[PDB]
Amino acid sequence: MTNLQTFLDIATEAALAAGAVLQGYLGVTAADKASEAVVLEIIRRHFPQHSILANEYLWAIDPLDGTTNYAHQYPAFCVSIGLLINGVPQVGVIYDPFHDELFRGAAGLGATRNRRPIKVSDTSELSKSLLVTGFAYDRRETPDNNYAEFCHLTHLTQGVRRSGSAALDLAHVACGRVDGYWERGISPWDVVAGVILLEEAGGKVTAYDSTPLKIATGRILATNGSIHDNLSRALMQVPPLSAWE
């Protein structure tokens, strides 16, 4: 509808403005602060009645996803700007300012990168798939550290990447550069924009066991749709690390 394109227009300009701020600093906490201020000013000026995640309309903003990467100048970081409408992701913009890759999606309006259409891959077999995952800040505090999962899928697939940016990982599923992505311990601002981007690109986003996505649990399974069942089953069957030599 007309509002969603208007929402997507403003989120795009906010992401590009913030991305330029992040690029300027390259010559970390200050950069993240400066990007957030730019994003908030734009969204609040155009949509004073909307809320920022913390009411029908709720913006989930990550001003700098991939903070560890950015501190090391590792080229995998982005701005993520997502809109929840009645708690459902409906508008998403993810901008990688180092590679100048602008991912945009909105419900019923399609998914693009640099304003050209993108689509998920068709891969259905784990043995022919390339996946990506991440590891949470709390990984030393719980036995559920995602290592078992990583090892298991690394054995069953062509490989599991680790980029260091959850938002970019979702964008890479959306354009078919990987076939699937899973992670625990993520935050709403890490994933809201990527979820609608991926769904518009033809993918599927659920919990690990293929029951509906519950962002509050911090767990996400996001695939091209064709590999969703095989990946869900492999994750639920995961042998513990103690079962390896």
* Cα R_g (the chain), whole angstroms: 17
Contact between 10 and its own copies by CB under 8 A: the answer reads: yes
SS3 call for 62: strand
Check the CA dihedral 44-174-150-152 and report its sign. positive
The residues that bridge with 182 in the sheet, in sequence order, are 133, 221
In the bound state with its own copies, the residue whose beta carbon lies nearer, of 162 and 214, is 162
Distance between CA 196 and CA 8 in Å, rounded? 12
Single residue of 26, 51, 56, 68 touching its own copies by CB under 8 A:
68
Other C-beta atoms closer than 10 Å to the C-beta of 151 total 16
Contact between 35 and its own copies by CB under 8 A: the answer reads: no
In the bound state with its own copies, the residue whose beta carbon lies nearer, of 42 and 222, is 42
Distance between CA 52 and CA 238 in Å, rounded? 37
Distance between CA 23 and CA 218 in Å, rounded? 29
Under 8 Å between Cβ of 45 and 32: no
- Burial string for 57-77 (b: 16+ CB within 10 Å, else e) reads bbbbbbbbbbbebbeeeeebb
Distance between CA 83 and CA 60 in Å, rounded? 6
Contact between 12 and its own copies by CB under 8 A: the answer reads: yes
* Minimum distance of its own copies from residue 211's CB (angstroms): 26
Contact between 218 and its own copies by CB under 8 A: the answer reads: no
Contact between 116 and its own copies by CB under 8 A: the answer reads: yes
* Minimum distance of its own copies from residue 214's CB (angstroms): 25
In the bound state with its own copies, the residue whose beta carbon lies nearer, of 66 and 213, is 66
C-to-N gaps above 2.5 Å in the chain, after residues: 27, 54
Contact between 150 and its own copies by CB under 8 A: the answer reads: yes
Instruction: Tell me which amino acid residue 75 is.
Output: P
Stretch in the footprint of its own copies (CB under 8 A) among 8-16, 54-62, 81-89, 197-205? 8-16
Single residue of 52, 135, 187, 238 touching its own copies by CB under 8 A:
135
Contact between 202 and its own copies by CB under 8 A: the answer reads: no
In the bound state with its own copies, the residue whose beta carbon lies nearer, of 43 and 60, is 43
Single residue of 49, 55, 86, 242 touching its own copies by CB under 8 A:
242
* Minimum distance of its own copies from residue 175's CB (angstroms): 8
List residues binding its own copies (CB under 8 A).
Answer: 2, 5-6, 9-10, 12-13, 16-17, 20, 24, 42, 45-46, 68-69, 72-75, 99, 114-116, 121, 130, 135, 139-140, 143, 145, 147, 150-151, 154-155, 158-164, 172, 176-179, 240-245
